[PDB]
Structures are given as C-alpha cells and as structure tokens.
A = this chain, B = another copy of it.
Amino acid sequence: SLSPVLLGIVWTFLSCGLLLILFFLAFTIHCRKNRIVKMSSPNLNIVTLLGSCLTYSSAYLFGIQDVSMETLIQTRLSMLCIGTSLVFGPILGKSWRLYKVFTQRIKDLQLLGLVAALLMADVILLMTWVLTDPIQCLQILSVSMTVTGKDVSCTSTSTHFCASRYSDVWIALIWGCKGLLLLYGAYLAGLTGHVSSPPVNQSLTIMVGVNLLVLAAGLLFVVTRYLHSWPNLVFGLTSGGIFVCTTTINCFIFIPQLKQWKAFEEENQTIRRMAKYF
C-alpha cells in the first residue's frame, strides 16, 4: 500500500544519514588522541552514534507493512526509545561534567553509569509494557447509534489497528520520563551557558535537540493517531522527523569538531612549511 517512489526516497535519505553517522564514527575512532577530538569526550560520542544508528534502523523498520506484526511494532518502537535515550544520555553527561569542573571540581565510568541507569529506566518501562499488555492487532467491526440529545445518527465502521488496551498510559509514561530528562537537560544547557567553545560546550545542541524532539513527537503522535488512513503520509512524516532530528543533533555535535580539527592541522601544516623553508 506504500508507493515504491516514497520508499526509495526515504531509504536513500536514511542510508545517507547512516553513512554520515559511520563517517563521524570513523573520524572519532581514528582521531581519538587529537587534542580537539580528545577534549570533546570521544568515548561518550560512540554511544551517541550508536543510538543514532538504532534510530535510523527503527526509521527503516517503520516502512514495512504486511509482515508477526505485533513483534515488528514493539521492536521498532523499543528500538526508537532505546536509540533516543542513547543519543541524549551522553550529551547530558558531557554538560554535567563541564558544569562540575567549572564549579569547584569525573571519570567516563561514572557518566556511563548514569547513562546506564537512564537506559535501565527505559528498559524497565518497555519490559513492563510488553509483558503487562502487548500490542495485539484486532479487527473491530461495530454498529454505533449516536444520541446527542437533539439528533440521532447511526454509523457502521469496520476498522483494524495495532495497539494496546491501555496505550495512552504507556504513552504518558514514556513521554513523561523523557520530558523530565529533557527538562533537566535544558537546565544543564543553561548552567553551562557560554562557558566554553561549541565543541566542548554542548548547550545549543541540547536546546535544538529537545525542541525538535518535542515538536516531532507531538506531530507524529497526532498524525499516527488520526491520519491512519494515509499510510504514505504517516510513513514519510515519521521517517522525515526521525531523520531530521537525528541528523541535526549529530551535525551540531560533530561539525564544530571537524572544522576545528581542519584549522588545527592547517596551522600545523603552516608551521611545518615554515620549518622546511628555513
């Protein structure tokens, strides 16, 4: 039921995003010991890039329709939740470390432990969601007689959807926990405001990321809920929102590093040129 053209366009965009993420991974693994890369916590960037990979994979999984379907939907939604937690944890840890060293001074292990607890919260919520009530797909046909007190109307609808019995409670939980995390992250971004350079100070990236996150989540929640008879629109909007948010966050993280690195080695090459000239 999905157009091949839209599928091809979305897959090409997601593959280009994955290639960009892999390029950033190669850059931050190869140039680990460089000053510009080393001062930007290259170990905590691996977790962000891994979460970005998970988010892109879930965006891919959002595009297959027919074939169970419950396992597919749970898999892609849990992949999205895990990937976004892994993307946003390291940034918050970096901001917290910058705040702590600035304010009357943290190893990578403690930050990774905090990120692991953050991930465990999501794992607990997803596990209790999957076990308490799965996302079983039901074919619903019914006849409804509407009485508003002034007019009588009758309608017969045969609808099919994949959802939980109490899906809004799990929604409100996941949205709520992520929102508390984002509020604390915005507080951290404010605290480490104009405290250092962009590659070290992850403050604009946090604000852009949380704003895009809230906007995309609201839009896609509404669109999935109500425009379910527009499969191409829902698929395109979901994939575009995931792609835009992930690509924007990763670009904000890594482009400053790339340009500062280019300037650093250009200066080193000029120094070597001067040494060779004499």
Q: Which residues of A contact B (CB under 8 A)?
A: 136-149, 166, 168-169, 172-173, 175-176, 179-180, 182-184, 186-193, 207, 210-211, 214-215, 218-219, 221-222, 225-226
Chain B residues whose C-beta falls within 8 Å of the C-beta of A189 in the assembled complex: 187, 190
Which residue, of A148, A184, A190, A222, has the highest number of chain B Cβ atoms within 10 A? A190
Offer 5 A-B interface pairs, CB within 8 angstroms, sorted by A: A138-B147, A172-B222, A176-B215, A180-B215, A184-B186
Known: A141-B144, A190-B190. 13 other contacts (CB 8 A): A137-B148, A138-B147, A138-B149, A142-B142, A168-B221, A168-B226, A172-B219, A179-B214, A179-B218, A183-B183, A183-B186, A183-B210, A187-B207
The oligomer's copy count stands at 2
Please give the distance in Å from A133's CB to the nearest CB on chain B. Answer: 12
A66 to chain B, nearest CB (A): 14
Residues of B within 8 Å of A226, CB to CB, are 166, 168-169
**Alpha-carbon separation in the docked complex, A146 to B136 (Å):** 12
* Bound: A209/B181 CA distance, A: 15
Instruction: Give the contacting residue for A139; candidates B148, B169, B172, B182; CB below 8 A.
Output: B148
Residues of B within 8 A of A186 (CB): 183-184, 186-187, 190
> Which B residues lie within 8 Å of A169 (CB)?
222, 226
CB distance from A82 to the nearest CB of B (A): 21
CB-based nearest B residue for A145: B141
Question: Given B140, B144, B180, B219, which contacts A140 in the complex, CB threshold below 8 Å?
Answer: B144
